[PDB]
Design a protein around this ligand. Structure first.
Ligand code: HEM
Ligand code: HEM
Ligand code: LFA
Ligand code: LFA
Ligand code: D10
Ligand code: D10
Ligand code: D10
Length: 206
């Protein structure tokens, strides 16, 4: 109840601040994209779709970081771990993945609604544009990864199905790079993360 919550907040204030920053940064990129498209005379569907898209870039930058296992294991042993629990890296990964799935659904729905406002048939917008085709494929990949990563499957005896489907992350990243064609800079964060992971693996290697 109330007493437990006060205790929790006091003991995890850095973690809470981290998450509040995560929320704030999502809101900033979302609203920034909304304001941009709105100033161009875009309808509300476009504004929402673009807002989701901007936050999808942001979360796409973050999703892999907690899964750089040697880097997280190194970090767990630094004084950073006295402030924020690096053991919860997987819980942050899961959170970023759920947020992204919600945003992907909204982005998809908003783009579908925007397709109805065009003097072009729906099927030509969805299966006759680069963005439609790549987006649909990216959506399917993501649905497959998301469904199989849920605990009833992943922890309920179908770990192998989860694990093989999750190797789709490679395909996910390829498609995202093909789908969001102008702004590829988001991937610099994981690229840097991956270089740190390689350096750490090298240092520990024989
Ligand atoms: C059928 C499903 C989808 C459709 C119809 C769709 C449609 C679009 C369209 C029309 C754009 C603008 C492309 C451009 O400016 O050249 C776009 C951009 C983007 N989409 Fe999708 N998309 C879909 C699924 C997804 C999924 C599943 C994700 C992420 C997991 C995603 C992430 C993005 C991102 C990051 C951008 C670039 C930022 C932006 O302009 O909003 N999309 N999408
Ligand atoms: C686009 C979305 C996602 C990407 C790109 C992604 C990527 C990854 C990667 C690269 C790994 C490490 C794989 C390895 O061990 O070799 C991983 C592990 C994991 N991911 Fe995701 N992931 C996504 C979404 C999700 C979602 C939505 C969930 C859960 C709701 C999730 C749960 C996990 C879990 C639990 C692991 C750890 C498996 C284990 O160590 O037992 N992921 N993810
Ligand atoms: C730049 C961001 C790097 C993220 C990877 C570091 C691991 C984050 C530490 C855990 C944060 C709290 C997660 C709480 C989830 C709540 C359920
Ligand atoms: C460790 C797992 C934590 C699960 C938390 C679930 C968070 C989901 C948040 C959904 C975000 C919705 C964004 C829609 C934008 C609409 C405009
Ligand atoms: C403003 C948003 C802050 C989110 C913190 C929630 C912490 C829940 C830990 C279980
Ligand atoms: C979730 C949004 C539903 C999209 C409606 C589009 C109907 C297209 C058929 C012409
Ligand atoms: C009006 C014809 C629309 C056909 C498009 C099929 C959309 C598949 C949604 C998953």
């Amino acid at each position: 109840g109330s007493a437990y919550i006060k205790y929790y907040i006091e003991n995890n204030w850095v973690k809470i601040a981290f998450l509040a920053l995560y929320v704030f940064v999502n809101m900033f990129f979302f609203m920034s994209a909304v304001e941009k498209y709105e100033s161009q005379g875009a309808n509300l569907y476009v504004q929402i779709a673009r807002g989701c898209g901007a936050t999808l870039n942001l979360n796409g930058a973050l999703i892999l970081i907690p899964m750089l296992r040697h880097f997280m294991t190194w970090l767990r042993k630094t004084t950073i771990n006295n402030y924020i629990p690096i053991d919860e890296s997987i819980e942050f990964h899961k959170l970023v993945g759920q947020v992204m799935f919600a945003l992907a659904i909204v982005h998809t729905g908003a783009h579908f609604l925007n397709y109805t406002t065009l003097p072009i048939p729906f099927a030509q917008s969805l299966f006759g544009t680069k963005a439609g085709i790549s987006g649909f494929l990216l959506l399917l990949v993501f649905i497959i990864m998301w469904v199989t990563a849920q605990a009833p499957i992943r922890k309920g005896g179908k770990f192998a199905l989860f694990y093989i489907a999750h190797m789709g992350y490679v395909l996910w990243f390829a498609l995202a790079l093909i789908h969001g064609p102008v702004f590829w800079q988001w991937v610099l964060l994981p690229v840097v993360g991956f270089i740190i992971e390689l350096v750490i693996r090298w240092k520990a290697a024989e």
